[PDB]
Design an enzyme around this catalytic site. Structure first.
Site, PDB file in Angstrom:
ATOM      1  N   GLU A   1       5.171  13.318   4.766  1.00 51.73           N
ATOM      2  CA  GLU A   1       4.717  13.321   3.438  1.00 51.73           C
ATOM      3  C   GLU A   1       3.273  13.689   2.998  1.00 51.73           C
ATOM      4  O   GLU A   1       2.351  13.003   2.408  1.00 51.73           O
ATOM      5  CB  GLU A   1       5.180  12.025   2.796  1.00 51.73           C
ATOM      6  CG  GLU A   1       6.750  11.678   2.603  1.00 51.73           C
ATOM      7  CD  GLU A   1       6.927  10.385   2.257  1.00 51.73           C
ATOM      8  OE1 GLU A   1       6.230   9.458   2.316  1.00 51.73           O
ATOM      9  OE2 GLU A   1       8.293  10.415   1.953  1.00 51.73           O
TER      10      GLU A   1
ATOM     11  N   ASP B   1      18.268   7.249  -0.981  1.00 48.64           N
ATOM     12  CA  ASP B   1      17.355   8.800  -0.937  1.00 48.64           C
ATOM     13  C   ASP B   1      18.023  10.005  -0.885  1.00 48.64           C
ATOM     14  O   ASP B   1      17.458  10.804  -1.351  1.00 48.64           O
ATOM     15  CB  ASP B   1      16.402   8.158   0.289  1.00 48.64           C
ATOM     16  CG  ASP B   1      15.604   6.995   0.050  1.00 48.64           C
ATOM     17  OD1 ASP B   1      15.177   6.615  -0.861  1.00 48.64           O
ATOM     18  OD2 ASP B   1      15.260   6.359   1.195  1.00 48.64           O
TER      19      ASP B   1
ATOM     20  N   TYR C   1       4.543   6.545  -4.612  1.00 51.61           N
ATOM     21  CA  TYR C   1       4.041   7.575  -3.866  1.00 51.61           C
ATOM     22  C   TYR C   1       2.920   8.119  -4.892  1.00 51.61           C
ATOM     23  O   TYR C   1       3.047   7.936  -6.039  1.00 51.61           O
ATOM     24  CB  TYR C   1       5.218   8.607  -3.977  1.00 51.61           C
ATOM     25  CG  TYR C   1       6.164   8.489  -3.053  1.00 51.61           C
ATOM     26  CD1 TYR C   1       6.263   7.467  -2.122  1.00 51.61           C
ATOM     27  CD2 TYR C   1       6.830   9.532  -2.272  1.00 51.61           C
ATOM     28  CE1 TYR C   1       6.808   7.240  -0.946  1.00 51.61           C
ATOM     29  CE2 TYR C   1       7.695   9.495  -1.178  1.00 51.61           C
ATOM     30  CZ  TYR C   1       7.641   8.069  -0.537  1.00 51.61           C
ATOM     31  OH  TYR C   1       8.519   8.014   0.701  1.00 51.61           O
TER      32      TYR C   1
ATOM     33  N   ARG D   1       0.993  10.417   5.854  1.00 50.73           N
ATOM     34  CA  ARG D   1       1.700   9.136   6.088  1.00 50.73           C
ATOM     35  C   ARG D   1       2.026   9.203   7.759  1.00 50.73           C
ATOM     36  O   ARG D   1       2.790   9.695   8.038  1.00 50.73           O
ATOM     37  CB  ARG D   1       2.661   8.837   5.237  1.00 50.73           C
ATOM     38  CG  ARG D   1       3.819   7.434   5.736  1.00 50.73           C
ATOM     39  CD  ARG D   1       5.170   7.517   4.610  1.00 50.73           C
ATOM     40  NE  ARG D   1       5.904   6.445   4.726  1.00 50.73           N
ATOM     41  CZ  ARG D   1       6.937   6.257   3.988  1.00 50.73           C
ATOM     42  NH1 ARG D   1       6.933   6.746   2.890  1.00 50.73           N
ATOM     43  NH2 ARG D   1       7.846   5.309   4.466  1.00 50.73           N
TER      44      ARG D   1
ATOM     45  N   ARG E   1       3.980  -1.983  -3.041  1.00 45.72           N
ATOM     46  CA  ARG E   1       3.665  -0.896  -3.935  1.00 45.72           C
ATOM     47  C   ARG E   1       3.319  -1.396  -5.340  1.00 45.72           C
ATOM     48  O   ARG E   1       4.032  -1.120  -6.325  1.00 45.72           O
ATOM     49  CB  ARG E   1       4.698   0.183  -4.037  1.00 45.72           C
ATOM     50  CG  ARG E   1       4.870   0.596  -2.470  1.00 45.72           C
ATOM     51  CD  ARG E   1       6.477   1.500  -2.591  1.00 45.72           C
ATOM     52  NE  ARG E   1       6.345   1.916  -1.192  1.00 45.72           N
ATOM     53  CZ  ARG E   1       7.331   2.820  -0.765  1.00 45.72           C
ATOM     54  NH1 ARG E   1       8.515   3.383  -1.595  1.00 45.72           N
ATOM     55  NH2 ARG E   1       7.216   3.450   0.314  1.00 45.72           N
TER      56      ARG E   1
END
Ligand SMILES: *[C@@H]1O[C@H](CO)[C@@H](O[C@@H]2O[C@H](CO)[C@@H](O[C@@H]3O[C@H](CO[C@H]4O[C@H](CO)[C@@H](O)[C@H](O[C@H]5O[C@H](CO)[C@@H](O)[C@H](O)[C@@H]5O)[C@@H]4O)[C@@H](O)[C@H](O[C@H]4O[C@H](CO)[C@@H](O)[C@H](O)[C@@H]4O[C@H]4O[C@H](CO)[C@@H](O)[C@H](O)[C@@H]4O[C@H]4O[C@H](CO)[C@@H](O)[C@H](O)[C@@H]4O)[C@@H]3O)[C@H](O)[C@H]2NC(C)=O)[C@H](O)[C@H]1NC(C)=O
Ligand SMILES: *[C@@H]1O[C@H](CO)[C@@H](O[C@@H]2O[C@H](CO)[C@@H](O[C@@H]3O[C@H](CO[C@H]4O[C@H](CO)[C@@H](O)[C@H](O[C@H]5O[C@H](CO)[C@@H](O)[C@H](O)[C@@H]5O)[C@@H]4O)[C@@H](O)[C@H](O[C@H]4O[C@H](CO)[C@@H](O)[C@H](O)[C@@H]4O[C@H]4O[C@H](CO)[C@@H](O)[C@H](O)[C@@H]4O[C@H]4O[C@H](CO)[C@@H](O)[C@H](O)[C@@H]4O)[C@@H]3O)[C@H](O)[C@H]2NC(C)=O)[C@H](O)[C@H]1NC(C)=O
Ligand SMILES: *[C@@H]1O[C@H](CO)[C@@H](O[C@@H]2O[C@H](CO)[C@@H](O[C@@H]3O[C@H](CO[C@H]4O[C@H](CO)[C@@H](O)[C@H](O[C@H]5O[C@H](CO)[C@@H](O)[C@H](O)[C@@H]5O)[C@@H]4O)[C@@H](O)[C@H](O[C@H]4O[C@H](CO)[C@@H](O)[C@H](O)[C@@H]4O[C@H]4O[C@H](CO)[C@@H](O)[C@H](O)[C@@H]4O[C@H]4O[C@H](CO)[C@@H](O)[C@H](O)[C@@H]4O)[C@@H]3O)[C@H](O)[C@H]2NC(C)=O)[C@H](O)[C@H]1NC(C)=O
Ligand SMILES: *[C@@H]1O[C@H](CO)[C@@H](O[C@@H]2O[C@H](CO)[C@@H](O[C@@H]3O[C@H](CO[C@H]4O[C@H](CO)[C@@H](O)[C@H](O[C@H]5O[C@H](CO)[C@@H](O)[C@H](O)[C@@H]5O)[C@@H]4O)[C@@H](O)[C@H](O[C@H]4O[C@H](CO)[C@@H](O)[C@H](O)[C@@H]4O[C@H]4O[C@H](CO)[C@@H](O)[C@H](O)[C@@H]4O[C@H]4O[C@H](CO)[C@@H](O)[C@H](O)[C@@H]4O)[C@@H]3O)[C@H](O)[C@H]2NC(C)=O)[C@H](O)[C@H]1NC(C)=O
Ligand SMILES: CC(=O)N[C@@H]1[C@@H](O)[C@@H](F)[C@](F)(C(=O)O)O[C@H]1C[C@H](O)CO
Ligand SMILES: CC(=O)N[C@@H]1[C@@H](O)[C@@H](F)[C@](F)(C(=O)O)O[C@H]1C[C@H](O)CO
Ligand SMILES: CC(=O)N[C@@H]1[C@@H](O)[C@@H](F)[C@](F)(C(=O)O)O[C@H]1C[C@H](O)CO
Ligand SMILES: CC(=O)N[C@@H]1[C@@H](O)[C@@H](F)[C@](F)(C(=O)O)O[C@H]1C[C@H](O)CO
Ligand SMILES: CC(=O)N[C@@H]1[C@@H](O)[C@@H](F)C(C(=O)O)=[O+][C@H]1C[C@H](O)CO
Ligand SMILES: [Ca+2]
Ligand SMILES: [Ca+2]
Ligand SMILES: [Ca+2]
Ligand SMILES: [Ca+2]
Lengths: 388, 388, 388, 388
Positions: free
Chosen positions: C197, C70, C324, C212, C290
């Site tokens: 976020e 990340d 996301y 979140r 996800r």
């Protein structure tokens, strides 16, 4: 806002400084660069750009095979930012065709492309990026024009066209355009016997074009145009410093009103600046092929049949390929005089480098300095072997 | 600043001159060109651009495998500069979907994309690059629209949609938009029996659309729309010069108010300019497949059931692939009349060239001249074998 | 010219229409597309653009190896034209860093990037494309912010930051910026127990953020901010329709002022629009990973601990990867109400598709319709096997 | 509209925040990125851009072979958007040559490129993207200039040039330009014994340049210029914190008016900000090679021959390559003081990484903060092995 007027004389030319160079073939070895030929340069009031005929393929693309051919349905006049290469992603298409000219009149740009088969070609005249006028072939033999920028005065932009034989008498016409419309045209007059590919520039309300006599002449024909009266005349450069290619060796005395003999049916587009003692001629260094390029100061070359060089500058060494060359000026620069400029097309590939299946070029361009600047040479710079 | 009004008549069409050509498939062989189909051309007051449905992949990309399919989630209306190819780096997305139209009203651009599965499609109407209105499927069978530019008059931009069977009666509606909002819609009237893919143009406050009767007709249906009264009518081109594809051979007498029989359940998007003696029809040269393209001058084609050609022009040889064709004009050019233009989609790849796994096209486009210009032919120019 | 004010309410949301889709991974298979993640969308008064964190390499480039990570020195906030892919040649860098937010205040754009090692990160606040303010880490544990657009009212643009543990209490602060300068900041208040976020939107002078809770909550914390008084409060969405991921199965009754338990130390960025009966929640269809994405209309979700769906829409099938998601609106559209929009990041590659060495995404985005539009699903569309 | 005036002092420098980073070599591994070296940054009133000398080839192109050489006909000053890489498709050519400087005077940009063989080089001075003045070599030994931005005050933009030996006395001149024309020039004065590659910045109507004494000095010469009186002086940084490379180890006392000995005939372009206690020096961490980069706060470094660091910041670790560094500021930012900035060239390839045949760089750039920000390190980030 207003039409530009040719109100300045030429600056004093004491040398040439580097203006732009795109290194297209070097960069095109590994990036999406279009194959071109017949390049030139032309200024708008806010920007000067490179122009050329695209071949509608990249150099690394398989369709570059065959691009020695001059006239196909896949050609277009493109332009792109000064000294960038003509890429797929940054090239703007002006119009479709395989012979062109373009010039800005101070308000907007006129661009002309000719397309068609040899016996049925036509010119489309675009003005402010719209088509306005069309002109059909008059001699049914490859209608064709300057391959470098036209010049305008008070809205009037003359353009030289030729239709007919490349190896015998042809029909040359001068069209006087304004806003893309035909104000008048005249058949070629004066003593030039054959005209192709005029390279033009404008000063003090007069437009001078140095052209290519493909049929007989190794001296270059010259057309001088009055864009207010819309009349012209023609002759040859008198000088023994012969500037076509191929050509015989230089004599001691040239010819003013006839082609200087020795080479038939061949030539190259070229240019000069003809301004009394401030006269510079461009030519290939080789008399045999498009190799090398030099500028020679030849006082009164236009009118003096024994004039010889008093100064010079190497642009491209005789061990490097050259090609077409032509004139342009930034008519919108500040200052008291117009600064002469020119480009040289650096042709790579066929027919001279036949290990590749393509023909393309890159561009180098210079403008005059009133300094006596040191010279370099300016080759294309690509290694053909990298493309094998 | 003001809405455009259709205040001019058509210029006299004596031939067609080359307008734009992108050579997309030739260039796309080695550069990042998007796969497309269903292209067209549309002008803003300052710029004319190419439009098409992207397939959301490049032609050299592995995802081009399968692009024969018409409707996927990876399609979008894109536009790009005239005669450049639709590249990844220069294409602007107008909206997402697999059927579209777009037109500028003089103040800003309306664009419409339809997306969705076959039984649940919807149109989104964008105006000034924002979504404004949405229209849900009314017949649950592939809601679809023009695939070429719409036309506006005083803010009113009618658009033809069809929802329902491609091989039987369907529900065709004419929506009248202004600023992206629905002023009114009407169900199809007149004697056209099936409507798809209308190609439209505007003159003297009236909008004429030439469409595709996919169900029964090899003559083309015509919708004429009054954008002030917001009413329309429909009929077929009366002429025996039949202009769909595939089609039977030309008869001696056509049909005005019914489909001319001989081919069922198939067709191609096409166009005409219908203006009394100044009437020109486009068609494929082959009666069997999308090969070749010609323009035929057919005086009073709309109203004369025995009219035959008095002049013509080859655009694409019958040994080259064609495809969809449609109408546009530069409504913002200077001058006393509107200059008719058209494009032809040159489809390459599947299903006819099945050695590649993709389907794509390039574009050629012409506008009318009042000269009698020499003709060339204008093929795509790519060698499929290079892609093997 | 003037600061934008949140003077409208939300439009009625009866369905979602397709807004933008870039197909980045499909196109990136054979073109110079940057690897990204953490995308979003944000509007200026004249243009809406895609935003994301670049990884400073293309997807086909060898440096894409390792892009599951990340936070590196090679990341930057980039933006690019709506529905185009984030390419090397069309992406504009907003600022350097690995966590971001950005919003336009009606006069110009503020953008914020955080960079640094985990224990010594700092935020740089850019305004009108110049750096203006810098904020050092306060808890020495990965200073981080929204990863979607902020919202402004009369010049005041609040932004939520968190510094501290991802798996325990952390220090969340709300900064109130104007022209890039700090007017005020407050520590997190209300009953939200962990914040990361935030996805924000603005209506009737109030800014609502759905965030979140990475530590304990499978319901989502909500911050409501008054940008005139510069005060806020927080709580959770009361509804049993749980919208984080991973999460337990939905209960019958949710929690208003505490995290709904069942999953610790994990989550995904998401959003909602909370507007009484006009309330829609986004979530992944899978409770485990996800995968899939749906919108659910859940009347009074914020305040009703037993609210269940009364309507819904599939965005991405549960057999396709999501990621996301976040909120944005075009605050400068015409009309009486603001049209809710959102994007979903479609993550491809690692960790789920580990035959490739990279992680990237593409983007899909929708806005609300007052129609009841037919639904499609909108997957990334790339074939991972093509990248092997 | 008006000429910029240096009316502010420097902001307080308490640390450095990340400003821009292009990751060019990482991205260039698989995209059309030009080979460069000698980069810098320069602001216009509306935009700051990256600048560098192109080598007229891409990094993946076969012509990158040989790009260790500094001076060829294929080099040009190019600029491109901040933090994007210098690609073929987004790089703008300022002028042709192998040594450059450029600065905006508040009305328009002056750019200077030198080209030519070693014994016959010339500078062309461009102003408002037109050539205006030319300057011929005065010492016939590699006429050369700053390789970073010049600074202007009320139209007057001084520029430092050197012509002559790199390893002995040379002829350094300061030219004072306005609108591209020479107002005045002076030979170097003061006690600096050799000058190359000045890094300049402007505050309170005075321009300070930190340069490279290639001949004898490991301390850096400093030129201070009064652009109203058009006079200058020179000396060395007095501090024992020696900032050239290569260099001997730091002593306890430096030299004010002579080169600090220990290394002959070598050096690197570098910079400082000299402002009393607010004085920060840049240098490579290695005394031996261009590795690592740090900023050191050295109060009164210019005037105190025993000054040592009171604070510092790592920019690049000593296990990463650095290169040239230089100064620029955004003279058009809002606020009461000018924010010091700098870039570091991160050189990759030859001569240190000789498994590749090329030399190139990427860029990192920082500006000062009045905060005490946490530090990161900022390497190029490319893996040379990927290029094998
Ligand atoms: C740093 O930069 C400097 C600036 O560029 C550079 O100095 C320049 O040097 C070049 C290269 O030498 C000079 O160009 C030449 O100029 C010649 C003309 O100048 C001479 O003649 C004048 C008139 O009588 C004299 O006034 C003049 O003297 C003055 O200036 C001197 C400076 O050089 C100074 O020393 C003197 O004392 C004095 O003050 C000088 O004597 C020009 O003639 C020459 O062109 C011919 O030669 C080239 C071959 O080198 C050919 O390529 C070219 O085509 C010309 O020759 C051909 O054509 C002629 C005309 O028909 C024929 O007579 C010839 O026979 C020959 O023809 C053959 O070849 C043809 C081409 O292939 C072919 O078509 C024919 O058929 C036939 O086969 C050249 O242009 C330049 O002027 C200098 N510029 C300046 C300002 O000085 C300097 O050297 C560099 N410094 C360093 C240290 O590197
Ligand atoms: C340089 O450029 C010039 C400009 O382009 C070019 O000259 C042009 O030449 C083209 C090609 O020949 C001409 O196009 C044709 O035009 C035909 C109509 O003109 C004729 O008929 C008129 C009416 O009776 C006459 O007035 C007219 O005479 C006048 O003009 C003459 C100039 O050519 C001049 O010499 C005369 O003396 C006089 O002043 C002329 O006689 C047109 O009919 C023709 O189209 C048909 O033919 C094509 C095949 O070639 C088909 O592809 C096309 O579809 C048309 O035929 C089909 O359809 C008809 C209608 O139904 C059927 O009757 C036919 O049977 C045929 O049907 C079959 O094929 C169909 C298509 O596949 C299929 O669907 C059917 O089922 C069936 O199978 C063509 O358009 C053009 O008009 C000329 N333009 C100008 C201004 O002159 C010049 O040649 C170039 N010069 C050089 C040196 O290269
Ligand atoms: C063309 O396009 C049309 C427009 O999109 C499309 O019609 C749409 O169809 C979709 C798909 O069916 C509809 O979405 C669903 O909406 C459900 C809610 O509506 C029902 O309940 C209402 C309240 O009681 C009723 O009012 C309503 O009736 C009305 O409308 C009808 C139209 O469909 C009409 O026929 C009626 O007569 C009447 O007028 C209707 O009965 C909504 O509940 C559903 O979401 C749940 O189901 C999904 C599974 O399909 C889940 O993915 C989703 O998460 C929801 O279920 C989960 O969560 C609930 C809440 O906690 C739990 O109770 C469930 O048990 C379940 O929980 C499990 O799964 C979770 C997710 O994985 C997990 O987290 C849990 O832990 C647990 O494992 C869905 O949204 C849509 O509303 C329709 N839109 C419109 C305008 O009609 C049409 O079909 C297309 N046409 C064609 C021809 O293709
Ligand atoms: C989070 O971010 C923080 C912000 O960046 C970071 O804190 C920063 O930490 C760095 C790295 O330590 C600090 O930089 C150093 O600063 C040194 C100067 O500060 C000292 O000396 C002052 C004067 O006496 C004291 O005032 C000062 O004390 C104060 O501040 C302290 C904070 O650190 C606090 O704890 C104190 O109590 C007090 O309040 C402090 O003691 C500076 O000297 C040092 O540079 C030298 O060292 C580097 C090696 O590490 C060299 O690369 C560099 O070149 C300098 O040494 C060389 O040169 C000197 C001058 O000639 C020689 O004397 C040396 O011998 C040495 O020379 C050799 O090496 C040369 C280079 O290779 C070569 O050329 C020579 O020939 C010879 O071989 C360094 O810059 C920074 O100031 C801190 N910033 C702040 C605001 O605190 C924090 O650590 C990060 N936090 C976490 C948790 O990671
Ligand atoms: C570029 C180049 O090699 N030019 C040389 C020149 O260097 C030279 F050697 C030449 F003989 C010439 O024509 O002058 O031959 C050229 C090649 C030839 O004329 C056509 O093949
Ligand atoms: C492009 C092309 O080859 N067109 C030819 C035409 O040249 C022609 F030969 C044709 F028979 C035709 O349909 O007219 O067949 C086409 C191919 C065929 O109709 C479908 O396969
Ligand atoms: C994209 C996808 O295949 N999603 C499936 C879903 O279709 C589904 F099968 C699932 F079980 C799920 O989590 O719902 O597993 C996903 C993969 C898994 O949860 C992580 O590996
Ligand atoms: C980038 C790098 O490895 N720098 C190291 C530094 O880490 C360090 F080890 C060094 F010894 C140095 O010069 O400080 O050597 C460099 C390489 C050398 O000086 C020239 O080859
Ligand atoms: C003009 C020129 O060759 N500059 C090179 C530069 O390209 C670059 F290659 C360089 C270097 O990296 O050290 O040194 C300079 C020349 C030195 O300053 C010695 O005079
Ligand atoms: Ca000749
Ligand atoms: Ca049909
Ligand atoms: Ca959670
Ligand atoms: Ca030194």
């Amino acid at each position: 806002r207003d039409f530009n007027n040719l109100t300045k004389g030429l600056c004093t030319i004491n040398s040439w400084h580097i203006y732009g160079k795109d290194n297209a073939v070097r960069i095109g070895e590994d990036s999406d660069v279009l194959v071109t030929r017949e390049p030139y340069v032309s200024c708008d009031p806010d920007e000067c750009r490179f122009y050329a005929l695209s071949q509608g393929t990249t150099i690394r693309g398989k369709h570059s095979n065959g691009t020695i051919h001059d006239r196909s349905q896949y050609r277009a006049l493109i332009s792109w930012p000064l000294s960038s290469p003509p890429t797929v992603y940054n090239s703007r298409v002006e119009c479709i065709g395989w012979s062109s000219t373009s010039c800005h009149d101070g308000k907007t740009r006129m661009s002309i492309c000719i397309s068609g088969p040899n016996n049925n070609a036509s010119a489309v005249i675009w003005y402010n990026r719209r088509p306005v006028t069309e002109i059909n072939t008059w001699a049914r033999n490859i209608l064709r024009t300057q391959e470098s920028e036209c010049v305008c005065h008070n809205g009037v932009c003359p353009v030289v066209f030729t239709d007919g034989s490349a190896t015998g008498p042809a029909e040359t016409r001068i069209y006087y355009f304004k806003e893309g419309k035909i104000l008048k045209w005249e058949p070629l007059a004066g003593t030039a016997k054959h005209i192709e590919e005029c390279s033009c520039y404008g000063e003090r309300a007069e437009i001078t074009c140095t052209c290519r006599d493909n049929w007989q002449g190794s001296n270059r024909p010259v057309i001088r145009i009055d864009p207010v009266a819309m009349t012209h005349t023609s002759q040859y450069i008198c000088s023994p410093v012969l500037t076509d290619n191929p050509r015989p060796n230089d004599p001691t005395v040239g010819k003013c009103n006839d082609p200087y003999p020795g080479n038939n049916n061949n030539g190259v587009k070229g240019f000069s600046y003809l301004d009394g003692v401030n006269t510079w001629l461009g030519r290939t260094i080789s008399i045999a092929s498009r190799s090398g390029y030099e500028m020679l100061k030849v006082p009164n070359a236009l009118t003096d049949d024994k004039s010889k060089p008093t100064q010079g500058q190497t642009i491209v060494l005789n061990t490097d390929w050259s090609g077409y060359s032509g004139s342009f000026m930034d008519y919108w620069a500040e200052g008291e005089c117009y600064r002469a400029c020119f480009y040289v097309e650096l042709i790579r590939g066929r027919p001279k480098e036949d290990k590749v299946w393509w023909t393309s070029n890159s561009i180098v361009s210079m403008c005059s300095s009133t300094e006596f600047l040191g010279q370099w040479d300016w080759p294309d710079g690509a290694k053909i072997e990298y493309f094998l």
